[PDB]
Amino acid sequence: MTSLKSVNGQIESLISPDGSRKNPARNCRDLKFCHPELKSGEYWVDPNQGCKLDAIKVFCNMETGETCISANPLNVPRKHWWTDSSAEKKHVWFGESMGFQFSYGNPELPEDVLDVQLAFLRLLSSRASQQITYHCKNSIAYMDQASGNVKKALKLMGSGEFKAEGNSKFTYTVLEDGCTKHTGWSKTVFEYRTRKAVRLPIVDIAPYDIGGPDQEFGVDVGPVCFL
Template sequence: RAESCPVFDWGEHRPFQAAPATRFSLSLPLQLEYAGASPVQLRFLRLHSRLASQKVSYSCRPALEQGQPQPEKEIHFLADSREQSYAASLQGCVPDNESSITDTIFQFTTEELSLLPLRDLAVFHNGDTSHQFGFTVGPVCFS
């Protein structure tokens, strides 16, 4: 499903009201990198484009307790400008009958070309330490 994400400053975090937010610590590179996408190449693409788009797939495995409601999560995506980011809420993993993994697709399309490619992401939650998730970050397309 497609999500509409508001844009705000990266340092600004609006945690959920019910409980303090926790940021996951992962042994991953600090920021997303794109092979062959040097600053010069990105500048050239931006000069010759009107739109930029990028897709991110969020995959999660529902908890074993099927009857338990999953807590809502918030996700932030850092823009290439490193001054703004996108924010979205996730309703938690909802199991379906076809697969044990649930996917949510975020499609970013903008005329503000300095926002893409995405450079970092953060997931905030309300104490759900059993949450299993992953991301697939697609290429950025300029047109």
């Protein structure tokens, strides 16, 4: 009878996973769907399903049904990261030069695996969104106070380029803009949200105003969230 009890529970787990490393579910949204009660917390979801042993630790915003992958590493430290030699200041790709590109998900799993689980969510979600902060000292993120212009605004590489202005479908929005005046380290917050998830996540960033001897910046990278 004990064996029967063990089997039945096991079977129930199969019909509905419970989010644990041992019993992951397809998206946070389903976990939400099949486990209405469960509260937002770290949960294990396996987007490509099939084998269960390659799921990923995501954060479920169990309110929205969003699945949110923290990006590793999470942050880029504060430093005066670039030279200021040209009178003209030009866009630079952090990851491409000096710099690393942002990686998303479990460090442990191989590239080809982190690609495909991400690929499914990214290919098959209703929409995706991602937030990113630019810490600044003496460095214009988006709006230049003195020009009242975005010419200085930075760029982001969706995977596709996200700019302040240009085709609307590819323009990030700003959520706050601390870094608009030069004088003595403040934060700007950007956001990209779309129905073509394939466009996310943000892998690289390009600050236009940079390399001043005065100029220093850091970043922290918010999770890419699929719904």
